[PDB]
């Protein structure tokens, strides 16, 4: 600590006085995260063996909630033509918990691959299906040109190119009839500078990549302030209070000492906040408990030493904290 002041003052002679050098902080010893039991596992690999998928606006959904999803059967490694992923890989979803999961399957074009993205616009994004901002998964795609493609175009599948307005996330339109396309309603039957909203795939196996079918499977993810029902492959790492730990509670990740308080919360209020809009007190999603968030102790380091020509004795001072280690 005598040399800590030498590098702070950038000199080999330390004059008498008090000088600040570093900042001490208590690191978390363990990780306390608590969520209840797992319900079921999502069909990540069961939708890859389907014979034919739905269209862009027709996407079929199988509802299996409570991530962790199925990590066992994974076809996503080097088995397909193109891999475009966002967020984290599905192998890493075992460390995260999501509320609801909707497995969707649809076929798009070459120029429509770049339009796939959470919270982004596009022809199929706004007018057909939009990815929510809560989706951390990978977008799986493969080239179906050897199957779904037909001579002169395949009109079996359909898609909607135009709509009177953009669709919000998690919204569907199954209507195949003639409705308003642009901003000026033409009152039913096509004409008056409007366009027929429904469209058909023109897939020709002999043209470029933009005109060829690509089977895309996306599992819709949802993340809210609702309490999570699952934690990891392992759950509790049983709580021991009055210690510095790293906690994730109801989706709020932080580091601090967990203590019990007298705070009275409403049954439907999951967690509160302080005047700083930061985590203050939270409730146990698994069982009935009330925990208060106390961040771990930290402060500045003060060095009290006499002159270099006087003595080498050094007194270390911690500001506004109690030392339990020493």
């Amino acid at each position: 600590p005598l040399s800590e002041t030498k590098c702070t003052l950038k000199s080999f002679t330390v004059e008498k006085g008090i000088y600040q050098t570093s900042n001490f902080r208590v690191q978390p010893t363990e990780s306390i995260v608590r969520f209840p039991n797992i319900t079921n596992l999502c069909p990540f690999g069961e939708v890859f063996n389907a014979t034919r998928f739905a269209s862009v606006y027709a996407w079929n959904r199988k509802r299996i909630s409570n991530c962790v999803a199925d990590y066992s059967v994974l076809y996503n490694s080097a088995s397909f033509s193109t891999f475009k992923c966002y967020g984290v890989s599905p192998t890493k979803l075992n460390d995260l918990c999501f509320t609801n999961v909707y497995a969707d399957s649809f076929v798009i074009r070459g120029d429509e691959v770049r339009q796939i993205a959470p919270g982004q616009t596009g022809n199929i994004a706004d007018y057909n299906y939009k990815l929510p901002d809560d989706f951390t998964g990978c977008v799986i795609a493969w080239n179906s040109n050897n199957l779904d493609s037909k001579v002169g175009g395949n009109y079996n599948y359909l898609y909607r190119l135009f709509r009177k307005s953009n669709l919000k996330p998690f919204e569907r339109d199954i209507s195949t009839e003639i409705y308003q396309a642009g901003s000026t309603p033409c009152n039913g039957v096509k004409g008056f500078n409007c366009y027929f909203p429904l469209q058909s795939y023109g897939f020709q196996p002999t043209y470029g990549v933009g005109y060829q079918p690509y089977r895309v499977v996306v599992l819709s993810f949802e993340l809210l302030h609702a309490p999570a029902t699952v934690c990891g492959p392992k759950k509790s790492t049983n709580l021991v209070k009055n210690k510095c730990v790293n906690f994730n509670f109801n989706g709020l990740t932080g580091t601090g000492v967990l203590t019990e308080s007298n705070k009275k919360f409403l049954p439907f209020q999951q967690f509160g906040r302080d005047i700083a809009d930061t985590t203050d007190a939270v409730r146990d999603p698994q069982t009935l408990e009330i925990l208060d968030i106390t961040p771990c102790s930290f402060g500045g380091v003060s060095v009290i030493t006499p002159g270099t020509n006087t003595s080498n004795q050094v007194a270390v001072l911690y500001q506004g904290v109690n030392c339990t280690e020493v």
């Binding site: 302080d274 005047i275 700083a276 930061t278 961040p295 402060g299 500045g300 500001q319 506004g320």
Partner: peptide
């Protein structure tokens, strides 16, 4: 004229004064 401890959690450190309140009235 707690607000002090609430602000100390985000990295705002209020240093105690060298001259306390008891010694001020003793100088006066």
């Amino acid at each position: 004229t707690d607000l002090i401890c609430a602000q100390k959690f985000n990295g705002l450190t209020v240093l105690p004064p060298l001259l306390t309140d008891e010694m001020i009235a003793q100088y006066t």
